[PDB]
Design a protein around this motif. Structure first.
Motif, short mmCIF file in Angstrom:
data_model
loop_
_atom_site.label_atom_id
_atom_site.label_comp_id
_atom_site.label_asym_id
_atom_site.label_seq_id
_atom_site.Cartn_x
_atom_site.Cartn_y
_atom_site.Cartn_z
N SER A 161 -1.85 3.48 -1.91
CA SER A 161 -2.01 4.84 -1.42
C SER A 161 -0.87 5.77 -1.80
O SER A 161 -1.04 6.99 -1.73
CB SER A 161 -2.17 4.80 0.09
OG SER A 161 -3.26 3.95 0.41
N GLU A 162 0.28 5.23 -2.20
CA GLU A 162 1.41 6.02 -2.66
C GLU A 162 1.85 5.53 -4.04
O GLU A 162 1.76 4.34 -4.35
CB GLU A 162 2.60 5.92 -1.70
CG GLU A 162 2.27 6.28 -0.29
CD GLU A 162 3.43 6.03 0.65
OE1 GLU A 162 4.33 5.24 0.30
OE2 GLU A 162 3.45 6.62 1.74
N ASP A 196 0.81 -1.21 0.00
CA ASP A 196 0.00 0.00 0.00
C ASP A 196 0.85 1.27 0.00
O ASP A 196 0.43 2.29 -0.57
CB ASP A 196 -0.93 -0.03 1.22
CG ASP A 196 -1.87 1.15 1.28
OD1 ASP A 196 -2.52 1.48 0.27
OD2 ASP A 196 -1.96 1.74 2.38
N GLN A 197 2.03 1.26 0.63
CA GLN A 197 2.83 2.47 0.82
C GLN A 197 4.29 2.24 0.42
O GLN A 197 5.18 2.17 1.28
CB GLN A 197 2.76 2.95 2.27
CG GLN A 197 1.40 3.60 2.62
CD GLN A 197 1.34 3.91 4.09
OE1 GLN A 197 1.00 3.05 4.90
NE2 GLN A 197 1.71 5.11 4.46
#
Ligand SMILES: Nc1ncnc2c1ncn2[C@@H]1O[C@H](CSCC[C@H](N)C(=O)O)[C@@H](O)[C@H]1O
Ligand SMILES: Nc1ncnc2c1ncn2[C@@H]1O[C@H](CSCC[C@H](N)C(=O)O)[C@@H](O)[C@H]1O
Lengths: 12, 275, 268, 12
Positions: free
Chosen positions: B216-217, B173-174
């Motif tokens: 998300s990134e 996610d990141q």
């Protein structure tokens, strides 16, 4: 059909 | 070794158009080849696909429980679908270590079932790993790796001598935060990062039931072929405080099923040093 | 005097403070419906055989809890809506904003409480229970997230978790720290005799990192040893009761029973 | 035999 464990891949 | 008229050497898994690389990457490219360890994985996978009743069981479990579990967790539950990034010889040639080299601590982030971790593990006294899949955590613990939480490994009070981040940046996610975290706990005088990425870059976060979400990134990996996408990575790594010491092209191989004896993706594999 | 074996309480062996707050429960309609439905499921021979086969097949590779979540089997029962309301001393229509259910399992107990809340949060360590909780549209938080969100909870439920988590005293102190203070209440259920362990994969287990000193030779003596534990975390008991902690059965038994002590706690 | 989902339980 199981395929690659990392998942499907798209293209460039 | 490879020659233009060598048969069944799968040159397209390893070669690149070196003139398409930026000149700073031309200098640190390392040519890999279809070597002994790679053929052992492939021959083992071909044999596994020949065991029809095992394949049929795996497909029945997969069919029945795929709505309730991720594909990764189903593979870990069955101990199937293991993968291969490099042989021990390829690993040692990329890191420039001798076969008997040893250091203190390895951290393998997103280690899956550990069958790639196992290639690297003889070089370390202590092996740590992270994973989000509950059945993969059990596979890692069977191998006696120390599984740390995904927000625990940054806070252990010690640093890691090699950190491996293989085929994780397109599945977490990141990823920018991950790369910064890696930099912050790598032993700085001698530590190295081993990083593998499937190109073309296509990130998503795996959820249950064949579903997925966008990360998300954003990693700024861009390009119209393998070489161009590699050319965008020096700047991505620089943003996280790393420079590329060596890199290679390797097939990301996966055990097969009833239909195919194995599966292949295209890995770019890097050794990073802190800067 | 209520004399059913699952609900009866020897009031004279409770300390004086606990005598004042004990609340008698009984085998009511909602309880009997759970038992009726459990008996019916155990009569589904092919379903029970399937569950047993899958549980044996995956037993080495998964925790028993995750196997139950994968199959949607072995759901449990702590209280009916009526019993929940009687313990909280609330009307059927009562509402408040935020519920957090720690260690929520498949949410089948959570959902008894849910109609009294706007927002329902849950934590779970089992991947397939998280799937169950997300199928019920609960907001799942990480186990180290829920106490660091910046907002507080109106009711925190912690049902049959204290004997199954690695750090129960930290857990109780963490609950205290994000409970809404003016009106917040905690719902805690504990199986007595108290026998804690942390579930691992494959029927394995580990000992908790923290010990609760809960001692006694029977339900009432063990309950008498709880007020001191609760107070270390800054809670006092507002109400409590004895309830059977029921679970769906299998091909040999129509249901299974443990002995719950169920408390409503108020912050000191 | 599956038992209680909360686990096996000892005695007093
Ligand atoms: N934030 C995260 N932390 C740890 N593991 C993660 C993660 N996000 C995804 N994963 C895991 O990352 C893995 C990506 S597949 C790569 C597995 C292995 N490193 C290999 O190269 O073959 C999956 O097993 C997935 O469960
Ligand atoms: N630290 C922790 N955080 C969240 N869940 C936990 C946990 N430790 C154990 N668990 C979960 O706690 C549950 C205990 S069984 C109790 C489930 C439910 N509250 C009921 O009363 O029926 C299990 O589902 C287990 O997965």
């Amino acid at each position: 059909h199981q395929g690659h464990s990392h998942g499907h891949q798209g293209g460039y | 070794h490879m020659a233009a008229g060598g048969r069944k050497e799968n040159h397209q898994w390893y070669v690149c158009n070196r003139e398409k690389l930026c000149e700073s990457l031309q200098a640190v490219f390392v040519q890999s080849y279809l070597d002994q360890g790679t053929q052992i994985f492939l021959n083992n996978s071909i044999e596994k696909s020949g065991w029809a009743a095992i394949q049929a069981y795996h497909s029945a479990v997969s069919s029945a429980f795929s709505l309730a579990m991720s594909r990764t967790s189903i593979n870990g539950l069955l101990g199937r679908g293991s993968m291969f990034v490099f042989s021990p010889d390829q690993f040692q040639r990329l890191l420039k270590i001798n076969p008997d080299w040893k250091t203190h601590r390895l951290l393998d982030l997103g280690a899956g079932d550990g069958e790639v971790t196992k290639i690297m593990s003889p070089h370390f006294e202590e092996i740590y790993a992270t994973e989000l899949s509950e059945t993969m955590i059990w596979q890692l613990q069977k191998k006696k790796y120390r599984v740390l939480g995904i927000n625990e490994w940054q806070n252990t009070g010690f640093q890691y001598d090699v950190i491996s981040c293989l085929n994780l940046l397109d599945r977490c996610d990141q990823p920018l935060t991950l790369l910064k975290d890696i930099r912050s706990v790598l032993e700085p005088t001698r530590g190295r990062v081993i990083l593998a990425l499937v190109l073309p870059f296509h990130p998503y976060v795996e959820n249950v039931g064949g579903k997925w979400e966008k990360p998300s990134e954003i990693l700024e990996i861009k390009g119209q072929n393998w070489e161009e996408q590699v050319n965008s990575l020096p700047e991505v790594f620089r943003k996280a405080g790393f420079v590329i010491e060596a890199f290679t092209r390797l097939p990301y191989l996966c055990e097969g099923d009833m239909y195919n004896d194995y599966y292949v993706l295209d890995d770019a594999v890097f050794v990073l040093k802190p800067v």
